[PDB]
Amino acid sequence: GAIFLEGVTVKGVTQVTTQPKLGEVQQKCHQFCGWEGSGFPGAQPVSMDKQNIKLLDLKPYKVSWKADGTRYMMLIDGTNEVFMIDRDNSVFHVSNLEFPFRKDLRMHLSNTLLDGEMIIDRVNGQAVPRYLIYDIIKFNSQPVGDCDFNVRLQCIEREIISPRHEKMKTGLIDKTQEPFSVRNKPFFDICTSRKLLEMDGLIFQPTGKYKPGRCDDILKWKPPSLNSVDFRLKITRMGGEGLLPQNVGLLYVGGYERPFAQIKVTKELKQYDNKIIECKFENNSWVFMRQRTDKSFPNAYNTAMAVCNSISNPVTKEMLFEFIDRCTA
Template sequence: MPIPDIPGVKADRGLAEQFRAEVAHLLGRRNNNFPGAQPVSFARKHLRELMEHDYYLCEKTDGIRCLLYFTNDGPNEIHYLIDRKNDYYFVPNLHFPRHDDPSYQTFHTGTIVDGELVYDQEPGGLKLRFLVFDCLAIDGKSQTEKPLDKRLGYFRTLVMKPWEELFVRRHPEERQFLPFELVFKEMSFPYALSWMFDVKLPDLKHGNDGLIFTCKETPYIFGTDEKILKWKPAHENTIDFRLRLGDFPPLVANGNTGGGGGGGGPDFDAKPNFDLMVFHNKGDYRAFAPLHVTDDDWEVLKSVAQQLDGRIVECYKDAAGRWRFKRDDRGRPHFRDDKHEANHVSTVDKVLESIDDAVSKEDLTRSEQRIRDAFKRRQAERERRAKEEEAMRRMREEKRKRESVGGGGEAGGVAYNNGEPADKRLKPEPS
């Protein structure tokens, strides 16, 4: 499945800086860097983590990670996609109605959602969709301090449901004019692993390269989040390096090789050495390992007919322990032109730990019953505590009524948050 390009018009430097400052202020941050959370690679120790804390499970979509920023220009709503490079792309013809306006004319501003742009394969061709998996702010209020289930609950109630009511139920014919459709990414129980591998993944309409486990109990973290776990099959466990070309071999001075002989100069048809560089600090890249390039690989690299030196390329470690470039759907190197920098050395260390201490699909499915049992125990304990607290509340209320003079007033109602608990919206447990 092809990876989509980001639609829209890229904002110039000055305008982008203005938006970066707005977003930082909205989120209560002191810097203007890309605020998106980043996962860590799944290692064996994380099996215990899934047994001790509540997580959501979803498939890892192979698309373009973006934030979607809702703001306004005077009376008009405007929307920008924000990529990993922290560049802003104006996307016209989007409308996100508010939940409290029956006319569906008013719109959200000061809102940021996190998601993935992806092509879905439909009978009529490819359909561009934005899969939302988190929410950072709604209508000028940061949601990042709330746990994930509350963030998703607010998003579903305040943003997703009004959009679905307008564009899915009332005016579905209008969706064809949208640059992309909004979709809430399905979340499952963390122990629904066999169902995920056997039912969900084979039925996907888009590319997939693993699983994501996200803790439902914790706030949104800017940058690396140790509570977002990225599991990939061994062949998909990759690192993004900066590619550095070494010297080309010299021409052989016999008149019959490479660029036609003559000797002395470099033979640009011959295969050079390739170094994979790791990002340590700003401007500080250090050699990590050679890139293993076969003769066939070299022909593929030449066929790209683009600059290779300095590009960020996704690589995997083969069975012989050699680093190879990952190929895209066309068999070409998967260059990460959506990123300014290669993976930081700290990320590289975590991926290497994940590779050396790899957790297989079979390891996951063997653990699902223990994950389920632990999840159910925590759930039962929460329900027990909730019943005790409710009983205590009622006892206090009855005591207050008895002690009040003249009968007192009516008991106050239980306060509910906006948005149903996210657990109620999870996919049914697999049978």
């Protein structure tokens, strides 16, 4: 899926289709996560519902602001050795991004695995790509993922940042040469989310060891407004013995054999046939907000459903707020 980050092209980043190199990069991630199945090892968060939000009271939590971004695990193996992994398992080599070892600045990091997002940013009216490091799985083969989220959070600071800063102070690293900015997402204790609220939602992160796979205790909250599902749009005349063969816009989701829903087909909706259509929910209806040129297939069925489970039994912008404030007492 060779689009690396959508909205910009970035210097040096390149999909890796070389057969020997790719099988390696992927293999080593599964390895580092202690991961079972096929595909992406990365921890997968779940959407907050009225049942989940009870966990914010069961153990300690940290919270940060989600921005829509793209999910990339960054594998730092060596000197030009840096790679990036997709939700898809797509692998990309990054070129002039260099990570100094904190003890010896001449050395480089190896056997390190990072978790984070690629986000585009705005200052000058032009796009500045950024990699935000929100977790760390391995360091020097050291299994820092089994450590505690504050431990891991600190590690990322002194092991992956301070060093890249020192070498920038000296001009061994001209920030300018590197394909993108590199930063750690700051996280806050549970009690501080009230002061905070392209930032599309919240992330609620537990204090325990890193786990790959579906994580029922890592909660992504989105305001019910922004809830959206991607269907493939199929409109067909529908009057076989029916008097009016009015063409009807049907919406399709991945994994489901028959139609998921219906949209009322607008005069404008039609040219989007066969192409992914992005829909919101409002009136007990679906609505067309935009077109996506980045996928030839819809969301997973169980994804669409967990969208619905979210919209009908929602966690409200206000519901979340009372829950936090009470516990802040």
